[PDB]
Structures are given as C-alpha cells and as structure tokens.
Amino acid sequence: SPTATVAEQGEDITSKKDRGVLKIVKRVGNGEETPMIGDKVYVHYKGKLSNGKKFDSSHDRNEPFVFSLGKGQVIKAWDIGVATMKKGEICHLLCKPEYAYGSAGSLPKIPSNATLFFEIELLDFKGEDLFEDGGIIRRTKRKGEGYSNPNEGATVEIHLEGRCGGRMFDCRDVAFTVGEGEDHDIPIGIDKALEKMQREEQCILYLGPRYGFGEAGKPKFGIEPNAELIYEVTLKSFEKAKESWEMDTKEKLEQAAIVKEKGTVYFKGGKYMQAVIQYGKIVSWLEMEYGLSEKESKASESFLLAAFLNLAMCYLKLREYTKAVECCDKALGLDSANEKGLYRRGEAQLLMNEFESAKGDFEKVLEVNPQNKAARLQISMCQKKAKEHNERDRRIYANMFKKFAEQDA
Amino acid sequence: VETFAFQAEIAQLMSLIINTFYSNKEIFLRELISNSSDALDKIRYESLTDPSKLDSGKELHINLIPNKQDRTLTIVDTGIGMTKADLINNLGTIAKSGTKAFMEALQAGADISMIGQFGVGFYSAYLVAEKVTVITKHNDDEQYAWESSAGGSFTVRTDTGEPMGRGTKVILHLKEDQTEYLEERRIKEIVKKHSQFIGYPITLFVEKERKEKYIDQEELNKTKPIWTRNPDDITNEEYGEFYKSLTNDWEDHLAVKHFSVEGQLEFRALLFVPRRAPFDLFENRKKKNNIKLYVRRVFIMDNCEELIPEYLNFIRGVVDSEDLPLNISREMLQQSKILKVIRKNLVKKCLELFTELAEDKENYKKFYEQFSKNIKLGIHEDSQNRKKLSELLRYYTSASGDEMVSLKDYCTRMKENQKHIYYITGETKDQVANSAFVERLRKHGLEVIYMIEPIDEYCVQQLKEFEGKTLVSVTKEGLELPEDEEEKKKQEEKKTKFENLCKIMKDILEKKVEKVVVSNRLVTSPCCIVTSTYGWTANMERIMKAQALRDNSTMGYMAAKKHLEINPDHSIIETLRQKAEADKNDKSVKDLVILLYETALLSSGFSLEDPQTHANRIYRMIKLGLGI
Amino acid sequence: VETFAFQAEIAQLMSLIINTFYSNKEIFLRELISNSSDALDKIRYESLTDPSKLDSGKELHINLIPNKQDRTLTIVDTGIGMTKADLINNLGTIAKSGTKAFMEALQAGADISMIGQFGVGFYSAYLVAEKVTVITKHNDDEQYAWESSAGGSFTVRTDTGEPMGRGTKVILHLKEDQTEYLEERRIKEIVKKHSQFIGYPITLFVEKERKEKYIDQEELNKTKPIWTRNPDDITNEEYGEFYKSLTNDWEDHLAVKHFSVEGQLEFRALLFVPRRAPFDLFENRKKKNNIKLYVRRVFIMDNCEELIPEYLNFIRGVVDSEDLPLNISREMLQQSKILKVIRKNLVKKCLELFTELAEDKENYKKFYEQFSKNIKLGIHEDSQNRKKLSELLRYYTSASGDEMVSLKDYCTRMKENQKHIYYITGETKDQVANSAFVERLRKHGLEVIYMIEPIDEYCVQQLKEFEGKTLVSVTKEGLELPEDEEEKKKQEEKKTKFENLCKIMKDILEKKVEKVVVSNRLVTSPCCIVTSTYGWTANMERIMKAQALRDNSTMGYMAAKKHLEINPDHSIIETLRQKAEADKNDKSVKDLVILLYETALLSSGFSLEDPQTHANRIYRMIKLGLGI
Amino acid sequence: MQPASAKWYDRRDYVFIEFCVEDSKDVNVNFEKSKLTFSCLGGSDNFKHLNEIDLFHCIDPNDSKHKRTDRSILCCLRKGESGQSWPRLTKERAKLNWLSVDFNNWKDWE
Ligand SMILES: Nc1ncnc2c1ncn2[C@@H]1O[C@H](COP(=O)(O)OP(=O)(O)NP(=O)(O)O)[C@@H](O)[C@H]1O
C-alpha cells in the first residue's frame, strides 16, 4: 500500500519543513535541477484519499498533468510534489489537509480537511520564455508582490549577479532607470525582463545575444557588443513605470517627446539598440492605453507612429528586417496612408527580398506623394530584384530534365 | 364434472415477489415513496369536497428518517392512512390494491391519477427489510401497527405509541447486509433518480450538526415537473431553471420543444437542445441516449436506444405518460411497439424544433457549430427524414464570405444554365478553396459548396439530390459544366490535338491511373487526379483507410479508379506535347510525366504509394538549385 | 395483537401473470415445452428404479400439433402426466410448483435437473390462448381433462376420450388474432431460438404433404447440447458439427474451449473461434456479442454486453449453468455480480485459448490475419490483460521480411546494448520500411517493428513496455540509439557546426516547426519531420483527423509539435549551411528551406497545410527546368 | 351500479373492447349507430355492472358482435368508416377512470 505508506515516510519537500508533503522515491530522476516558479511541468499522477476513494489521474489518460509553479494547478502538495522531482523520478506522495484544500473540499469525492495520497512520476519541464522567441528564459526562485511591474521609465533597486557565457564577473546591488542600462552597467535583457518582475521576486535569467550590453559591451569585464549572458536578479524595490490604469497618456507623451529625441541621439550615435529601447518604450507606454478622449487618442497614436517609424530605421540598421516590418505593420495600423510608414515597409520587405510585397507599398507611397523619388527608385529596385532572381533561377535550372536524362547511366 | 377456483401458494408467491420480480434492490424506496404519493393524493382528493378531512393535519408531505443505531429506515407521510379493514385487506392480500379500487369508483371529471395498480409494490420492502412495521392512522378508525417478516403471516395491533393524527409510518428494520440504504448519500441518489418529480415534498432527516440536533434536508424534490403545465403559459426562464434541475448543468438550454400527443398513446414531452455538445457525445457508448421516460411522474427508464435514433442522442429530455403498460418490475416498459410510436413523434417534433430554430439565424449558428455532426449523421442513418434534414444543412461556399449557407440559398443564387449543385470535399477549407478542381468553376462564376468534415463524405452518399438539382462532386470524372458551343468545339479540337500525348502518358503511368484525358475543369494547374464515379473519392479513400475497425476486403474494390486530367493550355503541357511528338520513349518525358502524376496525387489529396521515391526527385531538383 | 395469514386476490394475481410478467408472447411455447421436458425427466427418473413405470409407453417425446381449422396449438407430451389431485394442486394453485416439490423429494445424489421452479410458467399459455384444455393420464390414475379461460376458476373431469396411455396433451385454443403461432415458420423460429437444446425429441406435425396426412417435421432439435459431456469424450469433428449446428456456418471452428467451472457459480461453456471474421463483425453495432446464456439447457439471453468485452465479440459460444438466479420472465438474470464472475472466467480462458493456439503457428496465422484487430483493440480497452494480450501480437519487422513475428522474437534478437523496442507506424509496409526515420537503425543492424493498421496507433498508447523494454517510436524526438562515445562526440561537434543553420531555418519555417535540430536517426535523407515525445505521431494525427464523430477542437489540443531534424552529412545540408551563413535573407535559401520542409512533411507521413501552394513550386521548377 | 373495468384497442375495420368481468353472468350488449351499452352481473358477488359508451365515431350494429368467456366479455364494433383512426373510444374528451388501452394487442395499424 504505497499511498498508505507515504502517510509517515519520505523526504520532507515542503517550503515550511512542516512534514505536510512527503515523497518516497522509488527511482531517482536525471539532472540536479528540480522545477522552479513559472516553469511548465509535466507529471504522471494516480491518486487516493483518506475516505478510501479515488482522486484524479493523468496516468489513466496516458498524458501528464501540466503545472505552472507559484500559480499552481489544483493541490498545493501537487505543486510542492512537482517542484521537488528530477526528470524520470518515480515516487509516492503525501498531501496533509493544509496542503490539500483546508476546509474547502474538492470534486469528485474529497471531504473538508481530507488527506490525499498518490503514486507519481515526473516526465519533463520547460522554463518561462519571456517573449516566446528564445530572447530571454526566466526561472523563478521566489515569487514577489505586486500587480504592476517596473517596465522602461521606472527607477528600480535590484541585486544583480552577472555571467558572461556562464563566467561570473559582477555580484552587487545596482539602482537604475529602466531602458538605459549600458549607461548603468546593466544588459538590455535586464531592462526587458524587469517588465515582468514583482517586489522581492528572486529569479535566474538567461539572456540571448540581442539582450547583452548592446553596441557598448563591457570591456572592464571582457564582454563584447551583443554578448549572450546569464543572471541572478532580486527586484528589491521600485518607482513603477506607470501602466494605462495607473497614469494618463499625457504624462507618457511628454516623456515620449523627450525619449524620441534621446532615441534619435542614440541612433545618430550608432547605439541602435539604445534607440530601439527609446522608441520601443514609447511603443510599450502608448499602445497599452484605453479610456482616452479623441484628442488624447490622436496624440497617443501620433507618438506611437513616430516611434514605429524610427524603430523601423533602427531595426533596418541592426539588419533585423523582420522587426523593422513588424514596426511598419503598426505604423500602417495607426495610419494606413502614412508616407514614411508605407516606404519603410517597402524597404524592410525588399531588403528581405520579397519584392512583390515591397512594390505593393511603394506604389501606395506614390498615391500619397507622387513626387517621392525614393519610392520610384525602390520600385525599379523591386523589378531589378525580380528580373535578376528569375534570370539567376533560369541560369541554374535550365535544361535540368535533359541533364538528368544524360546523367542516368 | 367438478369446478374449482384457482388458489395461490402464499409462501412461494411472496418468495417470487421478493426474489424474482425486481432486479435492483434500490427500487424499494421508489415503491414506498409511490405508495406515500398515492396515500397523499387520496386525502388531497377527498378533502376537495370536505376540508374537515384535513382536521387531523394539513401539511401533505413525505419524510425519510434513516436511524443508523436502530439499523432502521423509516418512511412517513401525512396521506389518508388505513383503517383496520384496509390494513388486513390491502397489506394482508397479495395483488389487492386499494389505489386501483379507489380510482374505479371515481367520475371522469376527477383531477387525480395515482401510481399504484398491481397490488405488489409494498412487498418490495422485503428486498432490504428483515421485518416491516406499518404504523397507520385513518380519520375513521384508531391508530394501528401492522407488522411482519413476510413469513406467511402478519400481525395487526392497536397502537398505544406516538399519536400521528392522520397518515402512515412505514418502518423498515433493515438486513445487516443492506445498511447502505441508511447512508444519506445513497438515499439522495435513489430518491433523486427514481422519484424527484413526485408532486409532494420528500424531506430527508440527516444527522446532528458537528448545534442543530438533527438537520433535515428540506426537499429531495426541490423542483417541479413543469412539462405537466400548458406550453403557452411556461416562460423560457422557467424552462431554463428546469433544464438545470433536470441535468445538473450550470448552463441554459439553446432551444426547447414542449408538446403533447393525443390518441391511443397519450404523452407529454420536453426536448431540450443543450447550449454545448457534451465532450463525449459520440464517444460515450454507455450513455447511449439522453431521454428519460416517466409514467405518472415516476421514472421508468432512460438509456433505451429505441426512444430516439442515435443522431438525436444530444437532446436532453423527458417523456411522461398516463397509461402505458409497465413490466411487473416497473424497471421497464412492456409493449415495445409503443417505443416506435414514441420515436416517430419525438423525431417529428425535433425536426419542427430545428425548423423553427432555423428562423432564428443567430441561435441557429450556435446550434449548427456543435450539432452539424448530428444533422449529417441523420442524413446518413435516417432515410425518412433525409428531405427535412437536408434543409437544416449549412455549408461554406465559393460565393460565401467565410459564412455558412443552406442548399436553398445556393438554389437562390444558381445561374439558370445550371442543373446541378457543385460540391467539393477535402481536409481543410483552404485545401479545398485553393484546390485545382474549382479553377474553371471560379472562371465561369459558378458557386461551389465546400464540405470539409470527415462526416460530410458519408452525408453526400445519401444526399444525391436537393430540389430536383443533382448534388455533383467536382472531384469525379467528366464534370458537366454549362459550356457554350464555341467552348464545346474548342474542347473537341483540344481532345483531338492532344490524343497522341494522352496515349503516351497512359503508357508511362499504366496501372497507376485507369486513363489520361483532356480537361474541361482546369485553368492554371497543368493536371489533376479525379476518380471514376462508382467508388470512393480521393477524400473518402483517405477516411476509409483511417477507420481502425473497418475490414480491408472492401477497400480492395471500393477504392475508385484514378483518372489523370490534363489542362490543354498549360505551358508545361504544350511543351510536354512538343517533347512527346518528338520522341515517345524520351527519358526526360518518362521522369517528367511520373513527376506530374505524383504532384497531381498530392494536389488531388491522395497519398503517394511511396513518398520517399517522390522526395528523391525534389532532393535532385534541390541539388541543382543549390549547385551540387 | 391479532395474527393473520397473508392471502392473494386471485383475479388480480392471474392478471399480473398474463399482462405484466412476460413482455414477449412467444415464450408461451418455451414454457409448455419446459413443463413437458420436466414431465419427461420425472417419468425417466421413476423408470430408473422401477422400469414398469414405462409399461404404459416407452418413448419419451414432445409433439407440437398445430391445427389451423380448430385454431388450436396442441402440445403432446409422453412424460409422467398428472393424477386428479395433481391437476387440482399444480395447475389449480398459482405459484405451487410440482416440479420443485418432486426435485426436493429426491435424494441429493440424484443425477437429474429440471427447468421449473416458480410455479407460474403454465399460466403463460394465456398470453396466446383464449382457452386451455389439459388432457392427461398418470400410471396410478384415470384420464382427466382440466379446462379454463383463466377465469378465476377451472373444471376437472374424467375425460374418457381416446386413451393417452400416460402423459399430457395441452390444447391451446388461440385468440382471434394470435394465429401466427400456428405457422410452421413461426414455430421453427421459437423452438430453434428458445428450446433447441431440450434433452428430448421435439417433433412438429403440420398441415399435409401435397403423400402423408401431415408433415412429420421429425425433429426441431436434431443437435444435442455437446457442452454437457466431458472435454475428453469429444473429438474435433463433433465440436465442428456442433459449431455448424449452433451458427449455420459451413466451415469448422478454428479453435475451441470447453470449460468446467466449479464453486458458488457453477457453469460450463463452449467458446468457438470462427474460421473467419464476420463480414459485419465491428460494423453490426446491434450485435454486441455472439454468446448465448442457457440455464438447465433452456435459453435465457443472448447479446448481453456484460458476458464478454466487445473486443471478444467474434467468439460464437454457449454458456450453460444449473444454479443462476432468473428474473420472473426468465429472459434475464437478477444479479449483475453473476455476469461479472462469468465474464472473468470467459475472458481468462479465452486468453488461455489464444495462448494454446499461438503454439500452432499455421493455425495462429489463420487466426491473426482476421482477428488481429481484436487483440489490438483488446490492449487498448482491457487494462488487466495487456500483460497477456501483448504475447499474442504478431507484426512485420525490418529483419523478418514478409513473415510475422512476436515481441518475444524481437526480444530474442535484440542487441545487448538495446534497452528499447524500436517501432514505426504508417499507411503501408513499404512506406515505413523505405522511410527516412529508419535509416541509421537499419545501418546499426537494429530491428524496427512495422505497425500498419490504424488500430495499432491506439494499441501503442497503452502498450508502453514489454518484458521491461520500452517501446519507442522511431518517428519521435530524442531517439536514443545505442552508439559509441566517439559517435556521441561527433554528434555534439556536428550540433556545434550547424547551430547557425538550425537557427536560420527556424526563422524561415516560423510557426511551422517548434525546433530545427541536428540528428542521428538519418543517414541518406537530408531531413525529416519528427514529433515531440508527448504529442500525436504523424500517423496518429492523420487517423484522428479522419474520425468523423469526434469533436476536433476537444481532441486537437495535442496535435503534433513538429520538429525538423537535419542530417549533417547530406550534401544539400552542408551546402545550405554555407549559403545561410553567407546571407540569412538569400531568396534561394528562403525558397529551398521551405521546399525541404514541404518535402519532409510528405516523406514523414503528414499532409500539407495547402497542397496547391506546394504544387505551384514544383510547376515553377518544371517551367524553369524546361526553359518556359 | 358501477361501470365494469374495460381494456380497448382498434384495427382498420374494427374497434375492440374487453370488459374484465371474470365468471360473468346475465351479460347483455346493445349496439346502435353512435352508442354501445353493456351490462352484466359480476361472477364473484353478483354486483351489477353498467357501461354506457357514446362512441367517438359511427359503427355498424349489423357487423358488430360480442362474446362471453369465464374470464371476460369481448365486444367487436364495426367502424362506420374503415380506415378511421380512433384517438379515444368516446365522442367526449372524458377521462373514464375504468377505461384504458389494451397494450397486449394494440398496434399502430394505420
Ligand atoms: N402509505 C400508505 N398510505 C395509505 N395507503 C397505503 C399506503 N401504503 C400502502 N397503502 C395501501 O396498500 C395498497 C397496496 O399497496 P402496494 O402493495 O404498495 O401496491 P399498490 O401501490 O397499491 N400498486 P403498485 O405500487 O403498482 O404495486 C395500496 O393500494 C393502498 O391501499
């Protein structure tokens, strides 16, 4: 009776060391890591109860139950039982009343202050991708307090310990303005990850190369422009970058009038990711808005459009032409007849070699302004690209069925 | 000659009623609740012309009292009770029933209709009881206790105990192995299942708090049989509170049919379309159907596949009847020809429900998004209603803006030169809407119906015609387009100028196709695989090759013959003509023609007999594309 | 206290036995044949200890004699018959059983059994009869007639007609609309259905030849209930003749079990595996199973889904028992526990039958080529038996050729560094054997199990392991081949070399794959589409997308997480690396990477999200390749 | 004194009524175009029954009949129009408590 045995035996896996959740391990799993707050985690469960009845099972469907730690799924002892298992680990699991449901009970047959018991196997887990694009992974050691987070424009206090390709190089507290971090000894990935962090939250962050110390690097620590990094963060306290419920658009528009100029100075200074962070913070600040007057909404959409027109240029200079076109796609959502927004989209698509789509917006630049010489030149470049590509293909493929008929011997 | 009355061997006759009539012991509680519902109806009736009959008590109600420590279940009522004569008659005599004898005395204008008639139901108490005591008090006699272990005799005594005023108290001294009928969970289940529509409050006296000394659950029937009321008076809110009470659902109903049948059968029904399809609606082979049959508000049966056809199994509903024939167990209906006459009416009135739901388009979309499988399965299984069911179909079409239209909307838009409703089938709306077969239909401005579930391919086998227009697949041989004589002449000329190539390609592709032909159906694709008319389409074959329990032996002859069609104006095909007229046996023609066949199998929605031998052609084109 | 015996109201009690006990009238001929088989057993038993009991007649037989002129069905019986006192007792007293009284008067060692026990079966004659006469003579008494309309009375008198010798002649005067029970087709149905195994010759005497003055249909029961014999007495030709008699098949059974269960629930059974699978085996959703249940050689029920699980529905068989508790109509059992304990033994001995059949390879091939769907469906449903059913599985493999081999044979051939049983799934053996996924398995000399029927893709969800070896699909990610440390080092060096190409291809294929990865399962193909560990396989997704009556939103939640695997040794991929490194945006790399993906979906057994967008790439390459 | 308990059904040509009076005596039946009248003494006690049935549709007395048995009295009434369906036995919508459909021999013949 494994479910009866775990009532008084196993490793204490509780955060409180309270004996409320115990595991009897029958097969120790692979890896020394066990799941962290914000991980997606997959576990086989079969379950029984202090009234002698069945709980619920993922083993019976031949597919694991899926968990998100710190938010949980259904039982606090299952959240603890998940957070403390290695990959392919087999164990029996206890759940005392305070870790079950307390007084509340549960369906189908769980009474008030029940004890619950399980036979279990952990299958797999994945970290929190902060964007769903491999840019930053974050895994959390402790959940913090708050509904609003220090996005760009915030002043924050953090513990920050930093690693270059795994090599630790800095271990200290830093205070900074978010969305400026090379000027504060901080990577772009901390300026972005802090948009999702709470008070006294503790986490590990893996930062992709576009999330390093931008074009500046940190030569003091031996660190290159756009380096790939790993970090430990505690967010200790913050002056929050006010959300759309917390502050008006006018305050974010006066900050956008300063920040668009700073972005332009960073762009003309060759610091294209610092410019992306200026235009891109205006894009965060104004696209979150609601409940505006028509004049406030026109100002909000105008400073979005101007930020998307300069994000387009920065991402063109970065050769991130997909991000240039994702900005022009929204400049043309704010005004479908904006001349620079039609043009820049044509450039991003033509530099991406999709000339049929590029002429498809330069020809609209010539509806808005027939005198735009650049749209005329870039339409000719779309046709030069089309003709050269099809002639190249003809130079490659021509007579291949004769070549194959000749080669077959 | 000598003449004799029949006798009965009471010792064996009682043993039959206990051991052999009733297959589930739990029904004893429905029998003692039905006896109390009869006893309440008798006094409720007799009081209508004499209010003083209720002087002895006015609350008409039932109470259940499971006393665990005395191993006893009590069932009590404030019904009419029994005189000493009525005890020694109606409980002393097997197959005697005071309920029947009462109803035979009434005029036709009486509002009453009682459950009992067999004179057996009380004895079912001995399914669970070692011994039964019936305490009783009529108005016109003293309080008495009747008691027996069913052992061939019973005793009647004047009762000196607790005065009841007027009513009955059946005390069941349960068997040691039948103590589960003392558990309030079990009692709730049995009462809620068998009897929740009894017209009088059934109160269950549970347990001490943790303090309330003995908490009573006020009404196990905390509901009403609303179907007994006039359908013109009931509002949609009342139907909704009932639908939730009936089903334990939290959501409302989508549509409801409420009606009566008047004739040799008399019955009433509520039929509800639920807001959502159950997640298991076709998977749950155990819960086959969702109609419950009641007689006089007492439950008879539910999971009867005879009550409605399988395609309507989504309908949650109640049937209730005054005079149907019940089996001795009352666990089932007797005359199975009645289920046919119920089924004909339930189905007829469901297709009226959907026909009136189809006037309320905004709700009809909420219906069809979930029960289109049921309507289409109806077109498959039900040949009588197939006409009506076809007008319930909605489909996407080439002339519909990502919206679903009926075959009658298609008939409203058809060009007068058509005599057919053109349809296509495949795995997704984008796969069929981009597909090679519609190219000419789109050029002529002809509407194409898209049918894109695996169930659509079963539906169209039966749905051969609508409104005298032939439902014709665009994926089958010899598509009749409404051409003009100029185009018909061009097709005869194009069949003439390509017939050499058609022979050359048929020689290269032999047994992989039945034939190769010039196409009146393509514009911009060079070629496509269609099939012969008498067999499974490209879509049907892929569906049948995925039915896990289907016999392979039919697939070997129902799989239709692949015909390659050739576009006469595609530049690949005119070049392939110039190649084929130069050399019939050219290795470049041989490998190109089999590549066009494999590309046409994929574009037409077949699988390849071997994908790897096709991939090895594209990987050779890619070796050139890279410059290897 | 006043004590009373219980009584019965005969006029109502008789009306229950007529109206409410029996739902189908046709049983009246089962009852009157059974009462005759009991009368024949009674006189046979009295003859064993004193042969002079047969001096009034030595033949033991039942004759049905329809008479369309008099409208009567007669049933003659040369059994013991009844004295005047036995007519008045056993036909006159409802629920008195002269059979039960005789059976209890015997010594417990008596080698006999009798069908009657309830004492009501005779009254079922009044289902069809307007009036009944019973003419009878005993050895110890004169010839009498008993007669009644079931009018609450009956008449007995000394008949002095033509002499019976000894036995019974029931004459049923049928009602004005019950005359179908005189039709010889009707009688042949009812007797072959209900009473085919009665231990005495049931002869039918009908109309005339048109020549004998009647058609002497010399038997209705030419067969004998062979299951009552010992399994050592019977040869396979006798079981074969019985299987044809039971089923009207023209082939012998393939294999047979003959049981002898002892304990509380004592029963015998014959289970026959057919020579071939029924044409409608899984398609006839009305015929749940082909088992008939008998009590004392009289039919109780067929088609009861509780007797055996639907994966064994193909087994044609008889179950017979002395002691089961019958419902009052005799058409079902009282207790579901009896069906559980029957079914446990039926299933437990079927898996022994297949286990004994699997030693006889040539008969096992004849079984498995037809019933493999049933074993594989068994492993999906039957959680208790997977440990035994999986030893019955037989499959093609990459080292058996066109032979079928068991998982025990795979585990005989495994290399000592395997911990896994490698398997693959797809539409045909040649599609899977020549697939991309198997290439390095085939190079390492590792055997792959080929799984081909759509039912295998259900089976392997449940069949996770065999003999401690994990079954792993070669279409899924993370294929742990046994490989050397030098090969593990080279694989990580190749993952290092190709990390740019993998990232660049994922950006071109974005949302069409979850990953791009360098891999070890390939050798000669450039790439393949591999599913994640906990998704559907490519084959499973094709099967689920074709189940017409499943909610696609509700099942589609686990549709495949596609990974593109890359072969690092392929000249396409090595060249494509150089091009992707040189310019990430190169239109040649953007076109050829999507063409490698769309080719890899096909070689990996998916369908394309749109075949027309793919076919247009091929037609563009054909145009360029011809210079168009 | 009181109507006898009766079971009833039809066919294309006939409406059938069985009065369930076991060992019945002095049985009398009168057929008229729009009405049936039945009376008898009960076999257990000589209680006098009387049923008057003002019929749902016309009948033919010249082809209608009755029969007495030791179990019951059966009346066969010839429909005035063959193929008339009868939804009830009487011209009125009266719920006659002693009367019900005989589902041992009812069939939807129509
Ligand atoms: N609680 C009660 N109050 C008054 N009369 C009762 C009660 N219980 C039983 N009876 C009487 O007992 C008779 C026989 O009861 P019972 O054996 O339950 O069969 P039945 O209800 O009459 N008919 P059925 O339920 O179809 O078997 C009833 O008809 C009443 O006359």
Ligand SMILES: Nc1ncnc2c1ncn2[C@@H]1O[C@H](COP(=O)(O)OP(=O)(O)NP(=O)(O)O)[C@@H](O)[C@H]1O
């Ligand atoms: N043909 C017969 N020959 C001799 N005895 C008969 C015959 N038919 C009936 N009996 C007697 O009548 C008794 C009662 O018959 P019956 O009412 O049919 O019930 P049963 O056969 O005894 N038991 P069951 O079949 O379970 O209902 C039998 O047990 C015999 O004693």
